[PDB]
Design a protein around this ligand. Structure first.
Ligand SMILES: CCCCCCCCCCCCCCCCCC(=O)OC[C@H](COP(=O)([O-])OCC(O)COP(=O)([O-])OC[C@@H](COC(=O)CCCCCCCCCCCCCCCCC)OC(=O)CCCCCCCCCCCCCCCCC)OC(=O)CCCCCCCCCCCCCCCCC
Ligand SMILES: CC(C)=CCC/C(C)=C/CC/C(C)=C/CC/C(C)=C/CC/C(C)=C/CC/C(C)=C/CC/C(C)=C/CC/C(C)=C/CC/C(C)=C/CC1=C(C)C(=O)c2ccccc2C1=O
Ligand SMILES: CC(C)=CCC/C(C)=C/CC/C(C)=C/CC/C(C)=C/CC/C(C)=C\CC/C(C)=C/CC/C(C)=C/CC/C(C)=C/CC/C(C)=C/CC1=C(C)C(=O)c2ccccc2C1=O
Ligand SMILES: CC(C)=CCC/C(C)=C\CC/C(C)=C/CC/C(C)=C/CC/C(C)=C/CC/C(C)=C/CC/C(C)=C/CC/C(C)=C/CC/C(C)=C\CC1=C(C)C(=O)c2ccccc2C1=O
Ligand SMILES: CCCCCCCCCCCCCCCC(=O)O[C@H](COC(=O)CCCCCCC[C@@H](C)CCCCCCCCC)COP(=O)(O)O[C@H]1[C@H](O)[C@H](O)[C@H](O)[C@@H](O)[C@@H]1O
Ligand SMILES: CCCCCCCCCCCCCCCC(=O)O[C@H](COC(=O)CCCCCCC[C@@H](C)CCCCCCCCC)COP(=O)(O)O[C@H]1[C@H](O)[C@H](O)[C@H](O)[C@@H](O)[C@@H]1O
Ligand SMILES: CCCCCCCCCCCCCCCC(=O)O[C@H](COC(=O)CCCCCCC[C@@H](C)CCCCCCCCC)COP(=O)(O)O[C@H]1[C@H](O)[C@H](O)[C@H](O)[C@@H](O)[C@@H]1O
Ligand SMILES: CCCCCCCC/C=C\CCCCCCCC(=O)OC[C@H](COP(=O)(O)OCCN)OC(=O)CCCCCCCCCCCCCCC
Ligand code: HEM
Ligand code: HEM
Ligand SMILES: CCCCCCCCCCCCCCCC(=O)OC[C@H](C)OC(=O)CCCCCCCC[C@@H](C)CCCCCCCC
Ligand code: FES
Ligand code: FES
Lengths: 382, 535, 382, 53, 53
């Protein structure tokens, strides 16, 4: 029960380790070497085994360096000599790296399990409820700090500090978050009926009364003339085409003024629509919505692609069933009837675009959606 | 003279500072050597790899929606309008040496991070490591899991892709607009406008590389510090009590094996990044509101939220001139899930009455109701995940898509009940098996009695044997019991020579009796310590 | 010298604080309250003073909140009603916020300096050379960990682990930094003499032999026709004009194909040139460089704007002194002579562009710079 | 943190088309555009960036 | 303009003037010539996460 002022000099390594364990509350029981018997060749075999694992790790690390610096990396076009090498380039990087570090780890584990001595050290756990001396001394220190400070005695300071901190926190939090806060209902998008909020308006909202908005088909041409006017004859019974609200002013993408209007048309969340041609035989099964009975142009029905539930496109059109399925959450809308959901999370029908043909026979929108078209939100259905 | 250099450096360190006592405490700290206690280390190591790969990724990633035509090397996407985020992700994939590998190992590390967090949560929940001393640790770990989920969401949303973009559009935008009083305002604050607002990906990039990783790093520091100082709990065992830690010291064994385990986890993740393709964005065109795909799934850690979206039955309410879409249902569901997960230890202690300082873990069999509840929750989570995957499940395994959706809908209230009942009874039957072993000994081969033709299994008692054949039953002590003479002192001495050739008999005998002496010395040391604690 | 098993119960707060100080090596000397005399009105005045400071902090925090929520923020174009309010919008935010938190801090400091008791506590510093028990026990623990592990006996493991870790480290670091490393001398820029390096080539390098590269003036027009062909008559004696390498193919910025070539021209680091009209009276003071004697067109001299030292533009021009000054580091080049540096850090003359007039009189480069034009680097002057 | 919530790092060229009139239709990088947005079109953004600097 | 001029001076000129590896450091920092399209994203990473960390 003494700190060993001078006995440490002659205390051996084992005695010093035991002393450290004792001081820390740790008693090492059965710390025994793995190879008490000397000169055996099983020891040499295990030595060679861990050495082989570490050397495999090193060889694989060298392989990683050699393949990384010297290998046919770099994308190779389809069906070109060197495509196979490129394809298995990254796999080789990963294989070499992972094998190297994994083999090093295996060697380290084997060294721990075969050479580092085995111990069952048991540590005294002093968890919970620090001794009463420490508890009461901490409590006394904190209480003396609080009471000596003379707080809870200067009522004016107690209340004034609270008011000041609360007001400063209020001001700071409000100034931090007001930059982010924006009004969703600020009228910004221009429209024939004056500026309106974004959610109400899509690319199909007439900017000026009587504007012509063609159901332009989006050819995949990279950049130039991405949207081209469309005609009813182009679609045939049981066919679907994704159309966009193209204006004569939004000409081809050749100019710089254009190719931004066209990019806006393409990136409009509520812009894309699906034009579906209902078969003449199945035209008798169509059930129409209130205020949407005349929306269809003969056997052409234009429904927003944006799913009424969370707004994913509902592109999966199934003919001979007339079901517009959404891939995001597997909701079917019955196209024959007004595009009402007959399965899945959706509960509101897809907005139906009024369509017709202008002069020259090109398909144009005969108005705007009679309801907001994207996914629903609080300020809706009124 | 490396020894002299080490001695001089130690003396200089102990003169400038005085870390001798503290460092000795750290080195002598004892950690239990149970395998299940490495599950948290898996998550920690995956997190470290995530940091290291994320720094490399940020050195090459440009977050922006600024439209650009690719004009890169990847021929199948040339002249196509794309965000600079997608363009730089493609540049990492193709136009940086090893960038594809780095991003793939980063994504695989993210998946392993989520998976190992889930496995660690299961370990602690089923073993009762959240009780009185460590409910705060459980709480901060739950916050950590939530942060990991959402950071993975933002991470695979960072490179503006068709899949990730449609996932964002669904989850973030739709469910945010759905929220009744402040949904649209939250949407506009987060996106700075309508959904495709031109600040979304820069904001997510900041949140994902600086903000959320910073919070996760701070919470992991708190977690590891708490585990370090509230000494790690342990399973009941020979010398293990509520007031001691039986295991190995930090320095010689635990440090070496933890470092080696980190090396091997890094190796597994690198091998996956090499051999397995993760998120091949090049196949996925740049995000466009019109383009879609059939799959449209999130990473597995958000697959349960997506499955909740899919399965919940399209219940919408329409108050006076307003709408309450189906997204708010899932929002509230997620809120409830997180609240219950965070508040379970307090719920557990309110229900049961346990306010005792618990330092010995409980076997999941020994705690049936909690084991049953955990099994029920895991069954619900798996059902939700496979419901999110129902599209691909229906496609490959030929099941109607409607059939899978309704299987999920019915099973999210049926399968949890079935799994609860089965798990409760399974735990009680594991207890019954343990007591059978305690009262009869281990089972072995059958023998036919000499005088008559009775058959007796020839058990092996685990404790003192009565004057007659039958043994004195032992008392259950919360520790696993050996149900196979396999794992006891029976049939365990193969020729110790080599795989192909033997060794000299003298060497074999020396080694085998040395091992026998060492193992009986360990057993005797544990037995003596156990007797000393109370006796 | 005992841990006070049961004395702590009757130990008072002062005694417990002293005990904690003793345990931690801290002796609190002269911990005296600020207001020993009770009922004095100086105490009340000081109380009210700190309260006033905290209340000022709170009022200023509320002011920050109200100003942030309700103030004419938002940019106002110029000379507009509301421009004065906007100009001091942000200053008001900062004034309110800073005043609030500064007043809170002043109140806290005054409370500490006027009410919290004054103490001169002295802590025992145990710095340096932890006691020999701790030192020797740590050394024993570390040495036992090292020797017991049986390392420094398995030479094969000792060397194999080192080799493996070193190889893995080198594979990993090379594989980390190799993505970033790019050959600065990869021939990428096309040229009449085949692909050349970016540093060798600029916007003035003829892509094909005999190409016409007009010295186009960069009009400030926002986006459309940013670069316009130029004629010698446009400048007058003692005039400087910044010109760029415009090709007929690089037409106005109307098209999308254009406005990218033009953006490249504008953003070219080595592209901008300064065309100087040397006064005919001073034309006789001109000295000319080797191989640059015919570069000037009459009294027109085209020198690169990029300073020869660190590459900032040398845009400043002093006529009647003929000194091209660089703002970054105050280096002057004598335009009269070949643009050799006659002051400042620059040591190499600015590269001189050959110039002439094509048909119609438009100014066109008569070739390319006979030297690399940007700032110097290792691979130069050969 | 507040600045990162609003800053967009990129050289991707863009015409401003913002609120600051003296720089309208001028080619600029997205970094400059979003710094201008912080200064002008975000409430307290000018103050936040100024106190940051 | 001001800060980009400062970058052009220091980061580009000083880096590219260094004898043995100057141009190699310049190209590896800027992803190519001075106005390389990754400079500001790289500095953003360095400035919000790496160096502040
Ligand atoms: C980030 C994520 C990455 C992972 C990081 C997390 C790692 C955590 C493990 C903790 C290990 C630890 O802290 O050990 C240190 C440990 C400190 O504790 P100790 O020594 O046991 O002291 C007595 C107990 O602490 C007294 O404690 P106790 O046992 O009585 O219980 C009280 C306990 C109560 O329990 C708690 O509540 C602990 C939990 C803390 C909560 C959150 C704090 C941590 C937040 C981290 C955020 C990171 C971001 O309170 C604490 O001890 C809190 C300590 C906080 C430190 C946390 C470190 C992180 O000892 C050392 O300092 C050893 C290292 C010596 C360093 C010097 C070496 C040589 C000097 C060279 C310098 C330059 C050379 C040039 C020449
Ligand atoms: C919400 C929900 C769960 C709805 C129900 C849909 C569903 C999961 C139905 C079950 C799927 C199965 C098992 C179909 C086979 C036919 C069938 C039902 C037989 C009867 C089932 C039964 C009780 C059999 C008794 C014996 C028994 C337990 C058999 C199970 C057989 C199987 C399939 C075991 C493994 C379970 C399994 C992997 C199911 C598919 C789940 C997923 C998400 C696979 C993901 C996955 C896919 C989809 C790939 O295409 C792929 C391609 C290349 C590499 C990797 C993968 C990959 O990992
Ligand atoms: C009954 C009983 C006995 C109870 C016990 C009492 C009890 C609770 C004790 C514990 C006390 C607790 C919990 C104290 C607080 C601990 C705490 C927070 C400490 C600070 C932690 C720290 C250092 C930093 C903060 C880290 C942090 C973010 C913590 C919170 C983690 C949580 C809960 C995040 C939840 C996020 C979430 C979904 C919020 C809802 C808001 C909504 C609906 C947003 C919209 C939304 C978005 C934005 C999506 O991205 C999304 C993606 C996929 C599907 C849907 C959505 C979606 O709906
Ligand atoms: C193409 C390309 C760029 C490729 C590269 C991919 C990339 C971008 C990044 C990954 C590349 C790299 C750098 C990979 C290697 C990563 C790395 C450092 C691996 C180290 C593992 C290794 C080589 C081991 C060799 C074998 C050996 C001799 C091991 C013993 C000595 C060692 C290394 C000990 C390490 C100990 C260790 C893991 C310390 C971690 C430090 C931290 C963060 C916490 C410590 C800690 C731990 C570990 C707990 O478990 C714990 C449990 C309960 C409470 C508290 C704690 C606690 O505080
Ligand atoms: C206790 C604090 C009491 C104050 C409550 C504050 C909430 C009431 C707001 C009062 C101001 C409204 C009228 C005048 C203003 C107005 O009409 O703006 C509206 C938006 O109101 C704003 O200004 C910013 C809102 C302020 C953020 C408040 C943060 C939440 C608070 C309540 C929580 C912290 C308080 C402390 C409690 C918590 C303590 C912690 C425990 C809409 O913006 P908009 O028309 O689209 O223009 C956009 C510009 O605002 C936008 O800043 C700009 O950045 C643009 O993006 C722009 O488009
Ligand atoms: C001990 C390690 C021994 C290995 C020494 C490594 C240095 C020699 C490099 C050997 C490879 C050179 C020939 C084949 C390859 C070749 O021609 O590439 C050149 C560039 O060499 C490369 O590949 C990447 C260079 C490797 C980085 C090395 C990092 C420094 C090392 C020496 C320090 C760490 C080692 C450990 C010691 C420190 C221990 C810590 C104490 C030029 O690229 P370029 O033609 O422009 O194409 C670009 C593509 O490279 C580019 O990756 C791609 O991303 C593009 O951007 C592309 O444009
Ligand atoms: C993050 C990046 C980190 C760096 C990692 C990557 C670094 C890789 C560097 C090695 C790559 C190969 C060097 C290429 C480039 C190279 O370096 O040039 C060589 C030079 O060898 C010599 O003779 C020089 C020795 C003779 C003169 C004696 C000088 C002593 C000096 C050095 C003493 C002062 C040192 C003071 C230090 C101050 C430090 C300041 C802080 C010769 O030219 P060459 O190898 O044929 O290359 C041709 C191009 O010259 C050609 O313009 C082009 O047209 C191509 O053809 C190209 O291939
Ligand atoms: C995927 C699965 C879903 C996720 C599942 C995780 C959520 C937590 C799990 C289960 C909670 C319900 C447990 C069952 C609660 C038992 C009810 C009772 O009747 O109370 C009897 C007790 C014993 O009393 P005893 O003296 O031992 O005598 C024996 C008498 N026969 O009393 C009490 O102390 C407690 C009284 C009240 C406790 C309140 C607990 C709930 C608090 C709200 C948290 C949300 C709950 C969500 C539920 C899903
Ligand atoms: C980033 C995520 C996480 C990291 C890095 C992490 C790391 C760790 C580590 C290394 C341990 C000690 C080793 C072990 O007990 O397995 C531990 C213990 C613990 N973890 Fe986490 N874990 C994470 C997630 C979680 C989650 C989701 C929960 C819930 C949780 C709650 C706990 C608790 C209660 C303990 C104490 C267990 C004990 O005392 O033995 N952790 N954690
Ligand atoms: C802490 C847990 C983290 C998780 C779970 C996580 C998850 C992910 C995932 C799954 C991806 C998708 C990668 C791909 O699609 O190829 C990703 C991307 C990315 N991560 Fe993280 N990450 C984490 C931390 C970090 C950190 C700390 C950084 C920065 C140091 C970072 C930087 C990035 C970057 C720049 C990307 C985009 C690169 C790309 O698009 O390929 N991540 N993250
Ligand atoms: C996410 C939380 C979801 C909170 C919903 C808040 C609903 C507020 C508007 C309800 C309403 O009156 O609108 C008209 C209604 C649709 O039509 C009817 O009048 C007859 C409807 C019969 C079905 C009643 C079912 C009520 C169940 C909820 C009370 C349970 C919520 C948990
Ligand atoms: S996103 Fe279309 S049904 Fe849910
Ligand atoms: S940049 Fe021109 S003198 Fe230095």
């Amino acid at each position: 029960g003494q700190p060993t002022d001078a006995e440490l000099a002659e205390m051996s390594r084992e005695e010093l380790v035991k002393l450290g364990g004792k001081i820390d509350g740790v008693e090492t029981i059965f710390k025994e070497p793995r190879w008490p018997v000397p000169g055996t060749k099983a020891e040499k075999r295990t030595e060679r085994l861990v050495a082989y694992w570490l050397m495999l790790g090193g060889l694989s690390g060298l392989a990683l360096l050699l393949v990384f610096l010297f290998w046919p990396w770099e994308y190779q076009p389809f069906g070109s000599e060197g495509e196979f090498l490129y394809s298995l380039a990254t796999p080789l990087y990963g294989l070499t790296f992972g094998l190297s570090i994994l083999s090093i780890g295996i060697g380290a584990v084997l060294f721990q399990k075969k050479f580092i001595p085995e111990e069952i050290s048991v540590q005294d756990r002093h968890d919970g409820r620090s001794p009463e001396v420490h508890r009461k001394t901490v409590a006394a220190n904190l209480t003396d700090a609080l009471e000596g400070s003379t707080l809870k005695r200067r009522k004016v300071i107690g209340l004034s500090l609270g008011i000041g901190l609360g007001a400063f926190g209020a001001g700071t939090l409000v100034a931090f978050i007001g930059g982010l806060i924006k009004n969703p209902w600020k009228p910004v998008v221009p429209t024939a009926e004056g500026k309106k909020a974004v959610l109400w308006t899509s690319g199909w909202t007439p900017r000026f009364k009587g504007e012509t908005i063609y159901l332009a088909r989006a050819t995949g041409r990279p950049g130039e003339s991405p949207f081209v006017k469309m005609r009813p004859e182009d679609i045939d019974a049981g066919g679907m085409e994704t159309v966009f609200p193209w204006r004569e002013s939004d000409g081809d993408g050749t100019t710089v003024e254009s190719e931004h209007k066209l990019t806006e048309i393409a990136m409009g969340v509520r812009n894309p629509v699906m034009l579906i041609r209902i078969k003449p035989a199945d035209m008798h099964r169509v059930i129409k919505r209130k205020g949407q009975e005349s929306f269809n142009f003969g056997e052409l029905f234009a429904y927003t692609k944006v799913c009424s539930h969370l707004g994913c496109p509902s592109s999966l059109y199934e003919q001979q069933t007339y079901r517009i399925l959404c891939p995001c959450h597997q909701s079917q809308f019955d196209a024959l009837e007004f595009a009402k959901p007959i399965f899945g999370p959706a509960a509101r029908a897809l907005a139906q675009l009024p369509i017709t043909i202008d002069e020259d026979g090109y398909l144009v929108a005969n108005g705007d959606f009679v309801e907001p078209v994207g996914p629903a939100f609080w300020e809706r259905k009124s | 003279d490396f020894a002299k250099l080490a001695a001089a450096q130690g003396d200089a360190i102990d003169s400038r500072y005085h870390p001798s006592a503290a460092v000795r405490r750290q080195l002598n700290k004892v950690f239990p050597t149970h395998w299940s206690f490495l599950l948290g280390e898996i998550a920690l190591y995956s997190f470290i790899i995530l940091l290291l790969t994320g720094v490399w990724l940020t050195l090459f990633f440009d977050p922006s929606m600024a439209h650009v035509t690719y004009d890169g090397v990847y021929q199948p996407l040339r002249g196509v309008q794309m965000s600079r985020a997608y363009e730089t992700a493609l540049d990492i994939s193709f136009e940086v040496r090893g960038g594809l590998f780095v991003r793939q190992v980063h994504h695989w590390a993210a998946l392993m991070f989520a998976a190992s967090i889930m496995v660690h949560l299961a370990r602690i929940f089923f073993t009762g490591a959240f009780r009185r001393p460590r409910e705060a640790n459980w709480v901060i770990g739950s916050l950590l899991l939530i942060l990991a989920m959402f950071e993975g969401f933002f991470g695979y949303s960072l490179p503006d892709d068709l899949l990730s973009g449609t996932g964002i559009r669904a989850a973030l935008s739709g469910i945010t607009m759905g929220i009744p009083v402040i949904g649209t305002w939250m949407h506009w604050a987060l996106f700075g406008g309508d959904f495709p607002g031109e600040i979304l990906i820069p904001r997510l990039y900041a949140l994902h590389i600086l903000l959320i990783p910073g919070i996760i790093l701070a919470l992991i520091g708190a977690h590891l510090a708490l585990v370090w100082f509230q000494k790690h709990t342990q399973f009941p065992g020979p010398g293990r009590t509520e007031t001691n830690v039986v295991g190995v010291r930090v320095m010689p064994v635990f440090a070496v094996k933890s470092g080696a385990f980190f090396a091997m986890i890094t190796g597994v993740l690198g091998l996956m990044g090499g051999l397995l393709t993760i998120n091949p964005i090049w196949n996925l065109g740049p995000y466009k509101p019109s383009q879609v795909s059939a799959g449209s799934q999130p990473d597995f850690y958000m697959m349960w939220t997506d499955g909740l979206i899919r399965l919940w039955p399209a219940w919408e309410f329409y108050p006076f001139g307003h709408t309450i879409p189906q997204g708010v249902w899932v929002a509230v569901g997620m809120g409830l899930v997180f609240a219950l997960l965070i508040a379970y230890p307090f719920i557990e202690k309110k229900v049961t009455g346990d306010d005792a300082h618990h330092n010995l873990l409980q076997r999941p069999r020994d705690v049936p109701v909690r084991t049953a509840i955990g099994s029920m929750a895991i069954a619900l989570y798996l059902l939700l995940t496979f419901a999110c995957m129902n599209d691909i499940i229906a496609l490959k395994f030929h099941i109607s898509l409607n059939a899978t959706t309704w299987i999920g809908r019915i099973g999210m209230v049926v399968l949890p009940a079935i799994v609860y009942f089965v798990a409760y009874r399974w735990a009680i039957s594991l207890q019954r098996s343990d007591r059978e072993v305690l009262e009869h000994g281990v089972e072995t081969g059958i023998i036919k009695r000499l005088p008559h033709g009775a058959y007796v299994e020839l058990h092996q008692p685990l404790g003192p044997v009565d004057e007659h054949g039958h043994p004195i039953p032992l008392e259950y002590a919360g520790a696993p019991l050996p149900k196979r003479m396999n794992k006891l002192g029976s049939g365990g001495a193969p020729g110790t020579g080599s795989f192909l050739f033997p060794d000299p008999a003298v060497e074999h005998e020396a080694l085998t009796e040395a091992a026998h002496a060492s193992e009986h010395k360990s057993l005797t040391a544990l037995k003596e310590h156990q007797d000393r604690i109370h006796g």
